[PDB]
Design a protein around this ligand. Structure first.
Ligand SMILES: Cc1ncc(COP(=O)(O)O)c(/C=C/C(=O)C(=O)O)c1O
Ligand SMILES: Cc1ncc(COP(=O)(O)O)c(/C=C/C(=O)C(=O)O)c1O
Lengths: 351, 351
């Protein structure tokens, strides 16, 4: 039912009958139609959540990583490396283990979500925590791949974006056309770039009449693409996108311009509100960075910038399980009570 | 555009045109073929992992919750409740948020993995932590639902087994037949019961040529089914199955006897070994309780109790992200180093 992504889109990918397919059966994730928000519903605006949290490692990074490691192995690579806020690393770690090769991940000290650390650890990856942020780990890791015979699997590797563009193909395959708008978070910018590549590709093939407007959102304390210049000290509780100098900078600007979309900023508070809304009202638990997409939609809706009767697809990038710690910021765990029908019923608000 | 689990198997489920479908697009999870291990491959025994960690809330529980909540709302239920070691509660909280009703979850204080706690919290369930174990909470929750107008969604509710049995349907649909063996964890015994149900069904319907042996595995410190009597003080790091008086006790026993299988114990050490093996050797990150199934296979493989030239399927019940704390048990996180290629190469072990 959920075939190797490489196999599903073999026709549109730079692969051949000799490409070793290293796959954990990624992609083909649910496109969940949302109930609200109330604002959008009484405006005929329909929202769909492309839940990338259901990929093998819990994020969309598996999409780009399956093609990257597959091609790397095709080249005889026996190790890969990458800088990461957490998810790309977890993906490299898992696929390396799958391929039977070595994985080296460089993370920003103290700025990687507990779940993501747990993954690299258990998958037996070679972890290097550096005293710097993501942008520092990215530059460091690029050299690391030039000092040792290790394949770089960061978005700079063309295969990453080639694989990630498959998400747009899946959205069109399921809806029958491209949506009026597609919202997503923007970190190092590889994803928004890949999305746009996918939509233009299906459009040129005549599988999508319309080209959607790409709506990219960044945390206010790490919005380089929104200010128009790098952010040396990016900050945000949504650590997945605590990036101040996106590698695919031009890719995103181009995607924005060509699609007629935008790349704006949402505050950490708005992120947490959207974060809570999705889990509590829609039953969809994504990580804070992913919630930035919904927070961006709330923003545009609030400003009356979304046309009535339009379709909005949001790429919810990572599963909520990736960042357990943040759950404590939108709800508190009640203290224990005696194991008695009376005590429980009272604590349950039934008495 | 992609049907909910209830729809994929509507003809085999207790639903009708009157049943409102509460779905998060669950089921249809990957059946990943494993590379080994060596003991198996040498005997010509192939293994496949049904990765239920990729269901919407990260556990096979979604299969039953979708049917249980839908059937609850069809009957007018305004709230649902369940005792839980974490996954049934997370599932319940999510499907309740989806259906727009209340979810009350009774958790054993101190014995629910934090990923699972983060889920119930963010999804907005009314959490009640009791000073007792799962068995205590289940007993209390059954009394609570018989006392107040709240539908019980624990596996005691037959709808949960009807939903979960679909896993076997999917395994057969993909493999074309049922495996010689099917191993899984046994906690409150609802899953093994449903597995046999689904297999006996497809077999009679002519879809399943043979019948699997059903190999259930419990943690040594919480193996009432292996002991023959309830375990008053269940103990194990795999808190998901820290259960001493399984509700589906009879269903588990009959499934064992009827399929000519076994319900055996595995140590926590064997669990960890299996846990690391799957994530580091196969690239699949499941939680400890899930690994108990692989630990059982390693056990039968070494005891020479698995027939050569056989197919073995394993139900990996939950995603590793559910319980990140256990990662430190099989791997340590290296302390930070300066942001210098020089220092990173050293920390990477490349010198
Ligand atoms: C959940 C989640 N949501 C959004 C992004 C932003 O996507 P891009 O704009 O394509 O970079 C990330 C990024 C992660 C990393 O860059 C890494 O892990 O190294 C993420 O984990
Ligand atoms: C990952 C995981 N693996 C295996 C089991 C055992 O299956 P059952 O024998 O059908 O109960 C559970 C059980 C969880 C609960 O019983 C609960 O959450 O209340 C689990 O979370």
């Amino acid at each position: 039912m959920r075939p190797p992504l490489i196999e599903r889109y073999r026709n549109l990918l730079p692969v051949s009958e000799k490409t070793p397919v290293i796959s954990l059966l990624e992609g083909s994730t649910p496109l969940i139609p949302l109930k609200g928000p109330e604002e959008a519903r009484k405006k005929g605006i329909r929202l769909y959540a492309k839940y990338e949290g259901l990929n093998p490692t819990g994020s969309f990074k598996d999409r780009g990583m399956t093609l990257a490691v597959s091609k790397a192995v095709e080249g005889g690579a026996q190790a890969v490396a990458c800088a990461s806020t957490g998810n790309t690393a977890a993906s490299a770690a898992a696929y390396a283990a799958r391929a039977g090769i070595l994985a080296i991940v460089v993370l920003p000290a103290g700025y990687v979500a507990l779940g993501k650390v747990a993954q690299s650890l258990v998958h037996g990856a070679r972890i290097v925590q550096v005293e710097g942020n993501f942008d520092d780990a990215l530059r460091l890791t690029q050299k690391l791949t030039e000092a040792f015979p290790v394949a770089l699997v960061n978005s700079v590797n063309p295969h990453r974006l080639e694989g990630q563009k498959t998400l747009a193909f899946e959205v069109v395959d399921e809806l029958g056309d491209a949506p009026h708008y597609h919202a997503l978070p923007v970190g190092n910018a590889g994803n928004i770039t890949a999305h746009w590549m996918g939509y233009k590709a299906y459009h040129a093939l005549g599988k999508a009449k319309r080209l959607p407007r790409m709506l990219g959102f960044q945390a206010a304390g790490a919005a380089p693409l929104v200010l128009g210049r790098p952010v040396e000290r990016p900050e945000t509780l949504a650590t997945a996108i605590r990036i101040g100098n996106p590698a695919s900078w031009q890719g995103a600007v181009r995607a924005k311009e060509e699609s007629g979309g935008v790349i704006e900023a949402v505050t950490d508070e708005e992120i947490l509100f959207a974060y809570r809304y999705l889990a509590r009202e829609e039953g969809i638990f994504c990580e804070p960075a992913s919630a930035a997409a919904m927070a961006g939609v709330f923003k545009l809706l609030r400003e009356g910038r979304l046309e009535p009767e339009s379709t909005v697809v949001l790429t919810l990038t990572g599963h909520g399980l990736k960042d357990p710690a943040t759950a404590e910021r939108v709800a508190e765990l009640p203290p224990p009570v005696p194991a008695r029908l009376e005590a429980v019923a009272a604590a349950a608000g039934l008495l």
